[PDB]
Amino acid sequence: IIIATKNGKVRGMQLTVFGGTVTAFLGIPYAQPPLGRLRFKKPQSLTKWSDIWNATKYANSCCQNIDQSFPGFHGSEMWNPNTDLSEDCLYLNVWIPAPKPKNATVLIWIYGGGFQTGTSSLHVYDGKFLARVERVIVVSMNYRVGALGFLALPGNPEAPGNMGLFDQQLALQWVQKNIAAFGGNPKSVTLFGESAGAASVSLHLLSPGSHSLFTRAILQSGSFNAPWAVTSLYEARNRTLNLAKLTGCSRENETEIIKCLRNKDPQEILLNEAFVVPYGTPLSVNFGPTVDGDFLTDMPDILLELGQFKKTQILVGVNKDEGTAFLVYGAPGFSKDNNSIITRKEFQEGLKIFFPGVSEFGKESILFHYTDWVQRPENYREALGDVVGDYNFICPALEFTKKFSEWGNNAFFYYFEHRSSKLPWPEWMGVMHGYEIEFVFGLPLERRDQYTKAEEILSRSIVKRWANFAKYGNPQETQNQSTSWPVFKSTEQKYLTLNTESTRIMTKLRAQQCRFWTSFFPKV
Amino acid sequence: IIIATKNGKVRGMQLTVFGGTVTAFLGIPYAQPPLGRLRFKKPQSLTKWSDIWNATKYANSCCQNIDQSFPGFHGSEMWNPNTDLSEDCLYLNVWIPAPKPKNATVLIWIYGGGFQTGTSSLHVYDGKFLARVERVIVVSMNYRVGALGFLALPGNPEAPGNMGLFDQQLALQWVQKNIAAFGGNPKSVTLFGESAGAASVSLHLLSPGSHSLFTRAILQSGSFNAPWAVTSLYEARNRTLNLAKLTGCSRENETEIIKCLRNKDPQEILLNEAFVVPYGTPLSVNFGPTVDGDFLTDMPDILLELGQFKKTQILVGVNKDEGTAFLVYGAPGFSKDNNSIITRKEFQEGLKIFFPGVSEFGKESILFHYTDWVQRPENYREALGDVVGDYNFICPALEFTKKFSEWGNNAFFYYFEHRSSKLPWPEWMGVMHGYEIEFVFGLPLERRDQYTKAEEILSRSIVKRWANFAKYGNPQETQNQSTSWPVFKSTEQKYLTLNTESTRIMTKLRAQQCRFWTSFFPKV
Ligand SMILES: *[C@@H]1O[C@H](CO[C@H]2O[C@@H](C)[C@@H](O)[C@@H](O)[C@@H]2O)[C@@H](O[C@@H]2O[C@H](CO)[C@@H](O)[C@H](O)[C@H]2NC(C)=O)[C@H](O)[C@H]1NC(C)=O
Ligand SMILES: *[C@@H]1O[C@H](CO[C@H]2O[C@@H](C)[C@@H](O)[C@@H](O)[C@@H]2O)[C@@H](O[C@@H]2O[C@H](CO)[C@@H](O)[C@H](O)[C@H]2NC(C)=O)[C@H](O)[C@H]1NC(C)=O
Ligand SMILES: *[C@@H]1O[C@H](CO)[C@@H](O[C@@H]2O[C@H](CO)[C@@H](O)[C@H](O)[C@H]2NC(C)=O)[C@H](O)[C@H]1NC(C)=O
Ligand SMILES: *[C@@H]1O[C@H](CO)[C@@H](O[C@@H]2O[C@H](CO)[C@@H](O)[C@H](O)[C@H]2NC(C)=O)[C@H](O)[C@H]1NC(C)=O
Ligand SMILES: *[C@@H]1O[C@H](CO)[C@@H](O)[C@H](O)[C@H]1NC(C)=O
Ligand SMILES: *[C@@H]1O[C@H](CO)[C@@H](O)[C@H](O)[C@H]1NC(C)=O
Ligand SMILES: *[C@@H]1O[C@H](CO)[C@@H](O)[C@H](O)[C@H]1NC(C)=O
Ligand SMILES: *[C@@H]1O[C@H](CO)[C@@H](O)[C@H](O)[C@H]1NC(C)=O
Ligand SMILES: *[C@@H]1O[C@H](CO)[C@@H](O)[C@H](O)[C@H]1NC(C)=O
Ligand SMILES: *[C@@H]1O[C@H](CO)[C@@H](O)[C@H](O)[C@H]1NC(C)=O
Ligand SMILES: *[C@@H]1O[C@H](CO)[C@@H](O)[C@H](O)[C@H]1NC(C)=O
Ligand SMILES: *[C@@H]1O[C@H](CO)[C@@H](O)[C@H](O)[C@H]1NC(C)=O
Ligand SMILES: [Cl-]
Ligand SMILES: [Cl-]
Ligand SMILES: [Cl-]
Ligand SMILES: [Cl-]
Ligand SMILES: [Cl-]
Ligand SMILES: [Cl-]
Structure with missing residues (x-):
């Protein structure tokens, strides 16, 4: 199967999924490899090619530090790159239904990883079930991460900031110019992503340059108002220079620093990324999005507040135990290998970990807010995870949804409360951050795989809801007497719960907690 | 002039006020003197008398400790009793217009003093200007204060609690049964009072036994939800027993303690009142209202919340610098005799004074709330007075008004922002607590007295507004192209400013401050 694109022909491969066929085009290039003098620059457009580009395997993942905290452990290793790392990593994948569609809705995935890690080639991001089952086209891209994607010296095109957001954007253009050829509708494109991928999706809603590259947005466990999501221009400067110190690249002509940094092996840069901040947390985003005057014209909070963003429908949601995952990456007394019953003094030390300055x-x-016991030995353990999840994911997602919907558009909020029967982390960690993704992608649809029956059905439903959101702007499942998903409005704040038993309509998720994070804490 | 009452004839005296005459009946009795075995009991009804009771001078003030902090100083001494102290103090005064009215509206004053001090015979409470100028009848009563008025051992009629609130109530009955004889309308009775007198007025709105003894209410700088206004049953017990310890009256048959206390000289009781709490503030109410199951059937906060109170119009207001007065009674670095520029560490020590436990x-x-400077040397000095005024008077009055109006009735809120030209306290103390009273009573109407012209006019207006509230339920001044006073509603929260220059309609008095006191502080 050979598709003609604007730049050249590309060959895919046939896949057998559920007694049907999907066609996959794995590792199509979308920019000049950002090597040599292009290191730290915005992505540059690709020269046309003869011959057939073989898109028959996932390409390189971008350079990044790896999670080595639990070697041999699937719970953590499933997130690590499964493809060679390389600076030559600007590739994308396309799964198309077979038979070839006429004008399919397009779903574009943006992975998370804190803006420091990630790749589109993970097993949990495999778009073939969606293409098979919903007859959507699924697209995913690699974009640069860490200092290589987000090093900033504002105004200086040598290292402007936001390069990895420009990578995402240039991939959205490729879909604009090329997806009709695969049988896709460029006028029906939905972005979806989780955590940093979800924050990215929210920044595309604000970037004027992304306005006409997509239709609708889905934000899983992330938004650009979360505390980890945007690097201040002050922090960015300090960090660009700390990285300079550490590689012998300190200069004074700022363009001589970058030039110096372009001579370091990518691996010496990775090495020194961790130390650019005196005290980091398990939630550190050393090098992330900045206000660069290009992708992002002003503090995104000011943009949200004043309604300067793309006017469209959003689907936003969070998982029940967002914060637990991060606890075993530094909080005293925590372990995946035991029940992590901690003391008041442990709790207190944990805050110091997660709130260093x-x-x-x-x-x-x-x-004070989190310890008015309602005692029970897991009190402190439970409270620290709530602290981390509410502050970092839940309260920002809920505030993002309130503020966006106040400008007129329909918004749908979910609370994902199902723990995988297959989760390799302990029970106390609950419904973890990242563990809705396999449901969205339709992994439990694969019978050979050891999910329960209830899980198969939960995933089938979520897939239908996501696909109806993409195609029609309405995350309903209309055929199987399912709970209607009400619009979220800032008066009532109705949200839908996603679980195997019963979907519920509820109101005002975490209302006391978020009053604290949202209205009081910004002050301290 | 001899009026026949239910209990006997009473003779008044003629007064020349403003080229007119008022008739005053000063010191009419309204209960058996609460002496001997009646000490600590609810007021008992008075036996009829022959002869003409001469009501030609103010009677005894009830026993009470005196403010000796500034001997020879008018600013403090003007609040001290001006009549012999005596346990024989259950008397009231009546000023009636001359010529004698046909069916005059009645204004009943209840003094403040923290429930520990006060008397109706103060110069600033003289009702003759009001009777002269507005042709209302003004009534005032002495009621027991301190342990003699509010000692509690709940359930035990020997010392039930709230005795001084029952004194007020029995005086409201006297007006019910007797005021028609003076030319008053028992069906048009408005209670007014300041601070503890205003808190008392708010408790009469809650007491079912007071429902039919009045029409409308005015609350100046006080309400029953202020932190000093209601003694917990736990604190009351501890205090009744501490007082017992201190007078050698410790027993075990609780009725033997009271009997013991009935043998102490009133002066040994006064002496030991101050020490019943290990740490007091300048705002201490050692012996105040309790939930007694009689006057007050439940925690008044629960009553307000659930709309169990007299359904009628209220006028409520506060002064601009409520808290300043209390600062020179214990806050380090403060003095009426200097500008009291204090340091951060002084501020911090001051909190310890006002928030001991x-x-x-x-x-x-x-x-944190009060020091986000917007530096200036008076920053800390100003912040401590605001702390004290917002917490103690302003925020509770505003919350009382919100909660009362949510049940349907019209409510009017003022912010009094005029400093007397005659104020003997320094400039930094501002528009003090207590210093609207002379305006309400029409003292600046007396030309001989050295108030400015603007003050005369301010008082004339307030008097008209108060009298129209009493007579008609609407504090308007309709004749002189004056600012209309809007109803207070919990959405808009409009209030009227009272000053010599310009009355303003404003909204949401102290909105950030009260969110703090009202929604967060109750938690600590
Ligand atoms: C901006 O960065 C400086 C630099 O400090 C860092 O130097 C890096 C190369 C790296 O190895 C890092 O761990 C190291 O801390 C920060 O100032 C330093 O702060 C820490 C603790 O406060 C100390 O170790 C240093 O004594 C101190 N040195 C200097 C030069 O000031 C600083 O914290 C940071 N500012 C921001 C934006 O937080
Ligand atoms: C209830 O009262 C007790 C009694 O303490 C007081 O005794 C009084 C007669 C009086 O002179 C007063 O100043 C004295 O404090 C309180 O317990 C006492 O608390 C203070 C300080 O905490 C100490 O001086 C005493 O050691 C202590 N003694 C006892 C017997 O416990 C107590 O504070 C109080 N409880 C309440 C309701 O606050
Ligand atoms: C769970 O596992 C962790 C790590 O093995 C335990 O934490 C250690 O235990 C004690 C103090 O509580 C010390 O030996 C170490 O200082 C701790 N290490 C860390 C990083 O916390 C914890 O005690 C275990 N808890 C259980 C079984 O409840
Ligand atoms: C205002 O007057 C008070 C009391 O006279 C002063 O406070 C005293 O001054 C110093 C410490 O500041 C010490 O001598 C005493 O400990 C203080 N007494 C008290 C009760 O605070 C204050 O300094 C004066 N302030 C001025 C002129 O600004
Ligand atoms: C691309 O793949 C196909 C496999 O069938 C092959 O015919 C072609 O030569 C390939 N080109 C390469 C190896 O780059
Ligand atoms: C696809 O649908 C869009 C409307 O969403 C339409 O404008 C476009 O012409 C269609 N293209 C096809 C069927 O090739
Ligand atoms: C810094 O160096 C660059 C050459 O890379 C040059 O273009 C620029 O003018 C220099 N800036 C100054 C004026 O210091
Ligand atoms: C609804 O149920 C039917 C039959 O029970 C089945 O074909 C389908 O999988 C379900 N649909 C969705 C989208 O949940
Ligand atoms: C009451 O006062 C009048 C004063 O004119 C007097 O005639 C009468 O005897 C008085 N009774 C007393 C002194 O108690
Ligand atoms: C006074 O007015 C009331 C109505 O407010 C009325 O019921 C009463 O009869 C009047 N009494 C007089 C004029 O004596
Ligand atoms: C306490 O003493 C009183 C007498 O004053 C008596 O009425 C009461 O029964 C006694 N209470 C008891 C049972 O201890
Ligand atoms: C209104 O002004 C008139 C004349 O200027 C005067 O008689 C009266 O004192 C004023 N009325 C009030 C109640 O303020
Ligand atoms: Cl929950
Ligand atoms: Cl600190
Ligand atoms: Cl359902
Ligand atoms: Cl003010
Ligand atoms: Cl403490
Ligand atoms: Cl006016």
């Missing part, structure tokens, strides 16, 4: 009154105020 | 996080949170 916070005043002592700031931290006491968290403790 | 508050956790250290509680106090840091006050500091």
